[PDB]
Write a protein that binds this DNA or RNA. Sequence first.
DNA 1: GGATATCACAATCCATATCTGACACGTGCCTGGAGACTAGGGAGTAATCCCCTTGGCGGTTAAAACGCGGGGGACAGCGCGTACGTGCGTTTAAGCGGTGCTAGAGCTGTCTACGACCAATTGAGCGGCCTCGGCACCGGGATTGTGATATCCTAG
DNA 2: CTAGGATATCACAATCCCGGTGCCGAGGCCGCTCAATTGGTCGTAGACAGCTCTAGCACCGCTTAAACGCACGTACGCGCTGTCCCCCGCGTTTTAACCGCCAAGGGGATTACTCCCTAGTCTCCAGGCACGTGTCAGATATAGATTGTGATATCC
Lengths: 106, 106, 97, 99, 84, 81, 94, 93
Amino acid sequence: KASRSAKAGLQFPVGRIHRLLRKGNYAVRIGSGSAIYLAATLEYLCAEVLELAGNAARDNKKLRIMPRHIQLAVRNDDELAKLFEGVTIADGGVLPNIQSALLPKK
Amino acid sequence: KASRSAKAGLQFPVGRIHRLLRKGNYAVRIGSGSAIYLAATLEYLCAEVLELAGNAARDNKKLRIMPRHIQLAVRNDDELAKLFEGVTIADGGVLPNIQSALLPKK
Amino acid sequence: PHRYRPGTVALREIRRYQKSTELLIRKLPFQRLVREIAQDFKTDLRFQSSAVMALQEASEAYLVGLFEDTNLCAIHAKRVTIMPKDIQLARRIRGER
Amino acid sequence: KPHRYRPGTVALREIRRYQKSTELLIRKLPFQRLVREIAQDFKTDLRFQSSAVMALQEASEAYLVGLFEDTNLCAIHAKRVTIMPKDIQLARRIRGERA
Amino acid sequence: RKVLRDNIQGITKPAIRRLARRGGVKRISGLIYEETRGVLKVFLENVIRDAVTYTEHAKRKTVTAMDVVYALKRQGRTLYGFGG
Amino acid sequence: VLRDNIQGITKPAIRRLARRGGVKRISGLIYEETRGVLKVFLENVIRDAVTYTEHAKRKTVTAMDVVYALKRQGRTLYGFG
Amino acid sequence: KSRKESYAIYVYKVLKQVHPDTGISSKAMSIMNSFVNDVFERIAGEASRLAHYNKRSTITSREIQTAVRLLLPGELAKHAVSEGTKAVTKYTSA
Amino acid sequence: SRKESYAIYVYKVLKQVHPDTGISSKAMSIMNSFVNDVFERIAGEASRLAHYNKRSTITSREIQTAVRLLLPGELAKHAVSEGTKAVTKYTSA
DNA sequence: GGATATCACAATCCATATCTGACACGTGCCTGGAGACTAGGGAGTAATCCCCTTGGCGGTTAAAACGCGGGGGACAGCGCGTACGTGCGTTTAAGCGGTGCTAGAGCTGTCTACGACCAATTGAGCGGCCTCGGCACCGGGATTGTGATATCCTAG
DNA sequence: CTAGGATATCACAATCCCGGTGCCGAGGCCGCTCAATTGGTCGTAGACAGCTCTAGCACCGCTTAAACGCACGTACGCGCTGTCCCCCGCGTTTTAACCGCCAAGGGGATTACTCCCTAGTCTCCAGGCACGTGTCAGATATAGATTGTGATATCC
């Protein structure tokens, strides 16, 4: 038995996403391509976020992604900052940004 | 054959609200007490808005409710103003107000 | 001869336009602006004669709200003149760029 | 003469020290008591899970820091560095929290 | 069909004056207008695109008022008084 | 320093929150307004959380209830469910 | 011919019930109809989400009541809840 | 009782992207919640899109339009390209 | 000098024609909603086990609060200069109507392909546990950043 | 000479890098079980032709009201000073957060029965929409009255 994820070449599940879509009260019937396409987009977004988080973690000389790393990765990218416009990340801290006026004048 | 709107005493339709609920893909099955309750709440909200709009229209010596009157009634009541927090009313204008600092000093 | 001291005509305009509900931007210039903006995305579009009116109403409401916040920011700085820094600060606080 | 830092540099040092950690800035027990007395007014004798209070603390800390960023912007706008209650009120009234 | 260019200047300075007067502004600097002509030109570019996305999805070539209403509602800026 | 529990949010705690936010100098009247603002925010979140909890015929406020109450206000919280 | 539906007659009935001598314009009527549709959709969406949260498959009066208490704040929630409960009781008493 | 989260799949994606980088439990929970939130965003937008045109189905066209509406700018193009690639590879066995 | 007071002018509101587009009402008509009957499934109830939240005690011990001295910064004051509002005069798109035209919107008919359902099979994944390595504490030592201080220079 | 100012120089304290351990949370192996897949049918909805017809589009005649260009002056924003007063930074000590265990004991998740209500479908008949048509309250225009602002007159 070959799963639909294997045929589509995605890491994210296709059967589980299809079941969630069909048992989630979105439409009467749900096409076979919608689940695959949505799984592909979800996998792409997760890959982007994890790549940026890994870069941030390597910048701090660590080999484990923490919520702080994810906050740093998300808030240092325009597209992901727009996607995370109103989302709080637990235990993620804030970007280091001191205003120019507060800086020592001389 | 008395309509369900007459039994509950509500002016808003109960059968139409029930059909909209059932065909809007909100749940697989919908109880019969939801439609009546929702119709009652809709009727109360419409009655409140229309009452305030009519009071505003009388305040301006007019015998017909206009979008300007509805905007004035909505924004001159904190409860409905919060209910209309992010709502634009077409051809409604704004509340007549001038800040204190802009007013003449003497 | 006869002249109004600065501000009085401004107060008259403020009390007049706040009372009115009409549109403050002309129709043809806004329609041409909407068409040239939409030309970038999809070519050969055709706006209904009410979609342009809806866009005009939405844009006018958004600009009026922005100017209310800008006036608040200007009054905060102990001034009555709105400046581009005031608009920029208002848009930064509201959360859009 | 004992060493005494100029007024202001300690503030910048702790600003740099606190924008680097993810700890919880409000003490856990006082926040839990505040949450419990606030919830007491809506339903008598409510039980809070050990994670609901933590989630509330994280959300409130994020909200307060986000509000203080805009308060700082407003204070700098008026050619100041100190934040005063009028700055907080303006920052809240621009973004839409009527009170 | 004809191509349009340099029309943001069509939003004249008196129009911005009237818009600010409705918003309750007494004195206006000289550098507002240009800045405003930018801000407006962003708002439309953030709405019309969505409207176009809502139009070409239905295999249409007409941007009806309902598409614009849906695009505005998709931004927390619900507009009452245009169709449903 | 009890006065119920609202001064549980100690003045150094508000100073720490301001320092994290990026504030250099804080006035003396900031603390009362900050306490009031935090009390209002907590009231608004907890009312919705308690409504969600009592809708499900439970007496325990679950972390998921607070997550939903935050999601309802456009303040999505990641890390709790 | 199309048969597009709207709450026009019901809103007019309510207005005549609360203001016998006052009419209403067409643009204002469209505004009221849009507002009614928006509130109905918002309440129904919140109720459906609540039903999905508890894994319950039916939207009962409890879900709509809680949705109203969540969306409509302040004194409107109490009045709307009383109105809905009275209507439900009247219907159940035939 | 089972939880049915997205831990394994996010772990697989991270391992194929960064071979030598691990992920903490809190970060895994954050990523799971992020995937869920995006999934309901896209699904709700697709449902509203299907209901606007009186359609009673969610086809890949609807999910494509929802992706173009939610994801901002450069994310949308890459997402739609990879989704089209996945669909094409699936329909070709 | 300017501070108060007093009348004249432009803007606006209000009372009356008046004019008409706009709304309230009476007929088709047609379609959807209410009643009746049959079926099933979803949530209420009752019991049960155990899960996990709360109250209590207790020794730490680090945060905090009270005060005290100092400094720098927010505010009140003045001076100015510049730029923005107010009015005039003339030009120039705008709004409106009127016409014609052409693409695309909507609905009906038919074709087809495709997704839900149903059942049996099987393997992918979640909970459990077991082991291991990355992290945080901790202690030490460069490494600076900084506040105070000696050094040199210019007007009166 | 005498005073007051930038400028280069030194000792103190917090920061950051380099390891030495403890450990605690993450990576990896198993059980099995619950959900995904595969094979056929059906009825459904989406897709293709097409055919009216309907609304957006293009152009123009023109009336004129809004806009653009200028002169001018005045009122506000910017800038420089003094200051006092409010916050910062530091020292100490009382206090309240906190980690650790415990015993309830109140609440929550699960399961078996069930019965109440909600789903599916048909008739029909009455309510809601389309369509006209008559009545009127709002938009427009004058005309008179009231007011708010500004130029002018007198005094303290």
